[PDB]
């Protein structure tokens, strides 16, 4: 009856580890988003790119600022970037390969979000 | 539970104003008092802070208040900081050491003394991230007009939207139904096997 | 066979009870999980301090370019107090004049423009400069905090301003 | 099968161990990734010293002089700043002109 | 700079030359401070007195 | 000064205070508990 | 800073947490094995 | 020492730095008077730790730049919260969100069942004779 | 069969171990609550 | 044969509890000695 043992194992795993893990991850990311939007707003500067963090159904997500021709916006003009709320944003969930080190910048953005919050 | 204070824009403004008042503190012969008839708090992590400063020089009080407000909105987006500035009645281009519209509006409290009298006070819901508390302040100052400016700026900063912490934990009631059903179904499978 | 099914049902019921206690707002489970969480967070403090100190070292290396005046003691004004600080020649981290065995010397200001505070900070620069404290790992091993993750503080404010 | 059951149990153990003793949120996992990445970054970057390194320097098309320089390499923009006589010049490692300017001053270090 | 490690210095007639360039395989003349071509007849002796007769790659320079 | 004696002239290493409060504190043995629970489940399902 | 007091508790040399459980299981198994063998 | 002994000693040595604001120069006293700030509240020998002061000087220094600010709360009832009434009226700044950690000298309870269980447990073992 | 009885005995031993761990937690719940009340702030902090 | 199994499990529980208590006492005898020495007056109050 090893199979019933495995069934019990996976049932306990899911409903006593993964679901509380989902709740804990949502709570931590929501707290980080709250501590981020309580002072900071719109985009912030990380690795010469611009990232913002928004909370959705499946956790927090970082979107990077790009111009019309899918080029990341240089940090120097974040001023006007805060003036224009219709600037193009690309999500970090999709691994888009045209930008060199896009996932690198996304990971550093998440790390900076953790450090600031 | 010793929890950290959840820093928030109006809290930063109040603390900066209080620090500026303390660092320019001057002795005065005027009596400044706080009289609250009832204080009711029934929600967890609803910290209450009753700080009783009073500086007789109200002109310097508005100067420091405007300086602290300007330093606070130095981190907001430009459009939001500016619109909140006209909503309050303070202009950034004007030096803090100048009479603004807010001071002119609040001069109507010059005759009344520097006492804060509240008949009854109740603290509302305070949703804070775990490990932190939402702290509410009742600050007195050496002039009722400085108080006027204080509460109007505090309300204006409260008008902003800060995302709330949502509680996902279900309400807990003693679950004897689950163990009862488990026992009944254990008897059921015992009978089935037999 | 029958015993195996009975124990299967019993273990499923135990798991259901554990899930009920986990999801619900039970004070006992909350106390236990908060105990564990506090212990884990205090454990992770050290790694967080190391990472932040190292990143601040990189940003100090990047910032200290073409500016030899930032390597010498200066009376930085923090709006309410003066601190005589510089950047260390080795770690490239903010290093200020230490007050005894405590933190950096904070010359309290009685006004927006306080000449006496500046004069005393200069006096410390010229006389009592042999005792210094650096943000990062020396700060952690001496006073218990890294200087970062603390607001307001001269390390964080100097990193944000510069 | 027995092998399938053993594989499933091992996968159970691995997943439970990860979910218990490893981060389960984007922030902390990204912090660990950034830690490893920055360790590699610095392991590569520390090969460039900031010490006073003597080298032959070409001020013009027919002049040469021996002098000490300092080198600081950064990977955010991937450039080397060379310090000479109190003045710092930045040369990119991706631009052809900067590479042609910087290679002789590095390969001729006495 | 890992790519540039294969670069090494030699003499193209009377001028400085950089062999082993994957960035630009074509022949390029090394630039001085003012971004101008380098033309020394004695640059070979200078290379011999620093790196040696064999063209030392930038990898060995970094290893120094 | 009605609370002058509760403040220390010397600096306080509060990090060490928390480290000692955690070192000398009750240890919920979740590792041992989980191992014992897994052994109990395996014995009650498979062994028996 | 508020004075924290003194560290009265001493760091005694402890024992492994699992070791008591290990002894219990081992001694129970040995007792059962001897009882089965002798019987 | 008593006030009379203080006066006799300081009249014996009128130039001692230890007693310099109990008997200060008239210049200092009138500078303090003409500034609306009593001299004993700011003049350095008064602030000195080893300086000897009479009863009158002490009870007049104790009223140096003292403010008059009061808080009169009524029926306060707080649950699971924190109350921080500061009533602070000086240059000193209260340390907000300063977590005051003490040494928790916790005493670990041990899993010792009441040894009154020892007979009953023996009875448990005894019932194996029912299975023989 | 002696093996089944052995496995039942080991299961009872492990359940007794779990009960003793739970009894330890029950006894030290006061210490747990005191530690939580004193060290509540550091639940999600990044520094002291 | 259910009664025999019940007797075996309860006797095993008793023996295992005895061994757990013995080992815990062996490791914590000194600790409870100082606990009783520093809390001697807590045994019986003088307001009987």
UniProtKB/Swiss-Prot annotation, chain D:
Residues spanning the membrane: 1-20
Cellular compartments annotated: Virion membrane
Pfam families, per the entry: Chordopox_G3
Cellular compartments per GO CC: membrane; viral envelope; virion membrane
Signal sequence, start to end: none
Keyword tags: Fusion of virus membrane with host cell membrane, Fusion of virus membrane with host membrane, Late protein, Membrane, Signal-anchor, Transmembrane, Transmembrane helix, Viral envelope protein, Viral penetration into host cytoplasm, Virion, Virus entry into host cell
Induction details: Expressed in the late phase of the viral replicative cycle.
Membrane topology of the entry: Single-pass membrane protein
Disulfide bonds, paired cysteine numbers: none
InterPro entries according to UniProt: Poxvirus_G3
GO BP annotation list: fusion of virus membrane with host plasma membrane; symbiont entry into host cell
Membrane topology, Virion surface segments: 21-110
PTM description: Unglycosylated because produced in viral factories instead of the classic ER -Golgi route.
Description of how the protein assembles with itself and partners: Interacts with OPG099/L5. Component of the entry fusion complex (EFC) composed of OPG053/F9, OPG076/O3, OPG086/G3, OPG094/G9, OPG095/L1, OPG099/L5, OPG107/H2, OPG143/A16, OPG104/J5, OPG147/A21 and OPG155/A28. Except for OPG095/L1 and OPG053/F9, each of the EFC proteins is required for assembly or stability of the complex.
Similarity section: Belongs to the orthopoxvirus OPG086 family.
Protein name: Entry-fusion complex protein OPG086
Organism name: Vaccinia virus (strain Western Reserve)
Curated annotation (Swiss-Prot), chain F:
TM regions (residue ranges): 28-48
PTM remark: Unglycosylated because produced in viral factories instead of the classic ER -Golgi route.
Subcellular location: Virion membrane
Regulation: induction: Expressed in the late phase of the viral replicative cycle.
Assembly description: Interacts with OPG143/A16. Component of the entry fusion complex (EFC) composed of OPG053/F9, OPG076/O3, OPG086/G3, OPG094/G9, OPG095/L1, OPG099/L5, OPG107/H2, OPG143/A16, OPG104/J5, OPG147/A21 and OPG155/A28. Except for OPG095/L1 and OPG053/F9, each of the EFC proteins is required for assembly or stability of the complex.
Family: Belongs to the orthopoxvirus OPG086 family.
The protein's role, per its UniProt record: Component of the entry fusion complex (EFC), which consists of 11 proteins. During cell infection, this complex mediates entry of the virion core into the host cytoplasm by a two-step mechanism consisting of lipid mixing of the viral and cellular membranes and subsequent pore formation.
Name of protein: Entry-fusion complex protein OPG094
Organism the protein comes from: Vaccinia virus (strain Western Reserve)
Residues of the full protein shown: 293 to 340 of 340
Swiss-Prot record, chain H:
Keyword Ribosomal protein recorded: no
Keywords from the named record: Fusion of virus membrane with host cell membrane, Fusion of virus membrane with host membrane, Membrane, Signal-anchor, Transmembrane, Transmembrane helix, Viral envelope protein, Viral penetration into host cytoplasm, Virion, Virus entry into host cell
InterPro entries listed in its UniProt record: Pox_virus_G9/A16
Subcellular location: Virion membrane
Residues spanning the membrane: 112-132
Topology in membrane: Single-pass membrane protein
GO cellular component: membrane; viral envelope; virion membrane
Pfam families in the record: Pox_G9-A16
Gene Ontology annotations of biological process type: fusion of virus membrane with host plasma membrane; symbiont entry into host cell
Segments in the Virion surface topological domain: 1-111
Family under the similarity heading: Belongs to the orthopoxvirus OPG104 family.
Oligomer status and interactors: Part of a stable entry-fusion complex (EFC) which is at least composed of proteins OPG143, OPG147, OPG155, OPG086, OPG094, OPG107, OPG104, and OPG099. Formation of the viral membrane is necessary for the assembly of the complex.
The protein's name: Protein OPG104
The organism's taxonomic lineage, starting at the top: Viruses, Varidnaviria, Bamfordvirae, Nucleocytoviricota, Pokkesviricetes
Curated annotation (Swiss-Prot), chains I, J:
Expression induction or repression: Expressed in the late phase of the viral replicative cycle.
TM region(s), chain numbering: 1-20
Coiled-coil residue windows: none
Subcellular location: Virion membrane
Family to which this protein belongs: Belongs to the orthopoxvirus OPG155 protein family.
Biological role: Envelope protein required for virus entry into host cell and for cell-cell fusion (syncytium formation).
Gene designation per UniProt: OPG155
Lineage: Viruses, Varidnaviria, Bamfordvirae, Nucleocytoviricota, Pokkesviricetes
Protein's name in the database: Envelope protein OPG155
Quaternary structure note: Part of a stable entry-fusion complex (EFC) which is at least composed of proteins OPG143, OPG147, OPG155, OPG086, OPG094, OPG107, OPG104, and OPG099. Formation of the viral membrane is necessary for the assembly of the complex. Interacts directly with protein OPG107.
Post-translational changes noted in the entry: Contains two intramolecular disulfide bonds. They are created by the viral disulfide bond formation pathway, a poxvirus-specific pathway that operates on the cytoplasmic side of the MV membranes.
């Amino acid at each position: 009856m090893i199979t019933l043992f495995l069934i019990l194992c996976y049932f306990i795993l899911i409903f006593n580890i993964i679901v509380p893990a989902i709740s804990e991850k949502m709570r931590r990311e929501r707290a980080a988003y709250v501590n981020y939007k309580r002072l900071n707003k719109n985009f912030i500067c990380v690795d010469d790119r611009l990232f913002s963090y928004n909370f959705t159904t499946s956790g927090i997500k970082a979107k990077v600022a790009v111009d019309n021709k899918n080029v990341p916006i240089p940090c120097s003009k974040i001023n006007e970037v805060n003036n224009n709320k219709d600037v193009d944003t690309l999500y970090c969930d999709k691994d888009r390969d045209d930008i060199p080190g896009f996932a690198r910048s996304c990971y550093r953005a998440y790390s900076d979000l953790f450090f600031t919050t | 539970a010793e929890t950290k204070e959840f820093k928030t824009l109006y809290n930063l403004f109040i603390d900066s104003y209080l620090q500026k008042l303390a660092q320019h503190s001057i002795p005065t012969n005027v009596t400044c008092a706080i009289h609250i008839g009832e204080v009711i708090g029934q929600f967890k992590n609803c910290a209450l802070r009753i700080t009783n400063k009073c500086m007789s020089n109200s002109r310097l009080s508005f100067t420091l208040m405007v300086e602290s407000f300007i330093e606070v909105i130095s981190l907001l987006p430009e459009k939001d900081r500016r619109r909140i500035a006209e909503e309050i009645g303070i202009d950034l281009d004007d030096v803090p050491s100048a009479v603004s519209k807010l001071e002119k509006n609040c001069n109507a409290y010059a005759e009344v003394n520097n006492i804060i009298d509240i008949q009854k006070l109740d603290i509302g819901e305070c949703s804070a991230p775990p490990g932190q508390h939402m702290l509410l302040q009742i600050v007195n100052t050496g002039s009722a007009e400085a108080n006027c400016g204080l509460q109007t700026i505090v309300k204006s900063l409260n008008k902003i939207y800060v995302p709330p912490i949502i509680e996902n934990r279900l309400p807990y009631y003693d679950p004897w139904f689950l163990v009862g059903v488990a026992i009944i179904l254990v008897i059921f499978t015992v009978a089935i096997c037999s | 066979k029958t015993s195996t099914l009975i124990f299967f049902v019993i273990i499923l019921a135990i798991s259901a009870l554990l899930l009920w206690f986990q999801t619900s707002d039970n004070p006992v489970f909350n106390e236990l999980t908060r105990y564990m969480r506090i212990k884990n967070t205090v454990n992770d403090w050290k790694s967080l301090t190391d990472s932040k100190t190292k990143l601040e070292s990189d940003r100090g290396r990047l910032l200290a370019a073409g500016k030899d005046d930032i390597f010498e003691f200066k009376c930085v004004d923090f709006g309410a107090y003066f601190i005589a600080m510089r950047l260390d020649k080795k770690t490239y981290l903010p290093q200020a004049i230490r007050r005894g065995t405590g933190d950096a010397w904070m010359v309290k200001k009685a006004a927006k423009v306080d000449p006496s505070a500046q004069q005393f900070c200069q006096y410390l620069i010229k006389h009592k400069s042999n005792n210094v404290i650096t943000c990062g790992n020396e700060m952690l091993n001496e006073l218990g905090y890294s200087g970062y993750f603390m607001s307001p503080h001269w390390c964080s404010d100097f990193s944000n301003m510069e | 099968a027995s092998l399938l059951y053993l594989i499933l149990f091992l996968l159970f153990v691995c997943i439970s161990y990860y979910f218990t003793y490893y981060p389960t949120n984007k922030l902390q996992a990204a912090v660990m990734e950034t830690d490893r990445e920055n360790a590699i970054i610095r392991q590569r970057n520390d090969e460039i010293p900031t010490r006073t390194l003597d080298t032959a320097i070409f001020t013009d098309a027919s002049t040469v002089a021996s002098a000490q320089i300092h080198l600081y390499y950064n990977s955010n923009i991937g450039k080397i700043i060379m310090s000479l006589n109190g003045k710092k010049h930045t040369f990119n490692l991706y631009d052809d002109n900067d590479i042609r300017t910087l290679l002789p001053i590095l390969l001729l270090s006495k | 700079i890992d790519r540039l490690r294969r670069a090494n210095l030699a003499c193209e007639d009377d001028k400085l030359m950089i062999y082993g360039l994957p960035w630009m395989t074509t022949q390029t003349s090394a630039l001085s401070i003012n971004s101008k071509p380098i033309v020394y007849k004695d640059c070979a002796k200078l290379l011999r007195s620093i790196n040696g007769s064999q063209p030392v790659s930038l990898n060995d320079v970094l290893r120094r | 000064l009605s609370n002058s004696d509760r403040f220390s002239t010397v600096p306080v290493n509060r990090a060490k205070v928390v480290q000692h409060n955690i070192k000398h504190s009750f240890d919920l043995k979740l590792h041992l508990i989980s191992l014992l629970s897994l052994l109990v489940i395996w014995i009650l399902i498979v062994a028996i | 800073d508020v004075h924290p007091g003194e560290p009265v508790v001493k760091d005694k040399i402890k024992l492994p947490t699992w070791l008591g459980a290990a002894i219990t299981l081992v001694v129970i198994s040995v007792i059962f094995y001897f009882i089965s063998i002798y019987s | 020492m008593t006030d009379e002994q203080i006066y006799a000693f300081c009249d014996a040595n009128k130039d001692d730095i230890r007693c310099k604001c109990i008997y200060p120069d008239k210049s200092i006293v009138r500078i303090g008077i003409d500034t609306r700030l009593p001299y004993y509240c700011w003049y350095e020998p008064c602030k000195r730790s080893d300086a000897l002061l009479p009863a009158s000087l002490k009870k007049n220094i104790t009223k140096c730049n003292v403010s008059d600010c009061t808080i009169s709360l009524g029926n306060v009832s707080i649950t699971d919260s924190k109350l921080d009434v500061n009533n602070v009226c000086d240059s000193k700044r209260v340390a907000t969100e300063n977590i005051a950690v003490r040494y928790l000298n916790q005493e670990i309870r041990y899993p010792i069942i009441d040894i009154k269980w020892l007979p009953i447990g023996l009875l448990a073992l005894a019932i194996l004779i029912l299975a023989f | 069969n002696s093996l089944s009885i052995f496995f039942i005995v080991v299961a009872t031993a492990a359940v007794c171990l779990l009960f003793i761990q739970g009894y330890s937690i029950y006894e030290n719940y006061g210490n747990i609550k005191e530690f939580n009340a004193t060290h509540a702030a550091f639940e999600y902090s990044k520094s002291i």
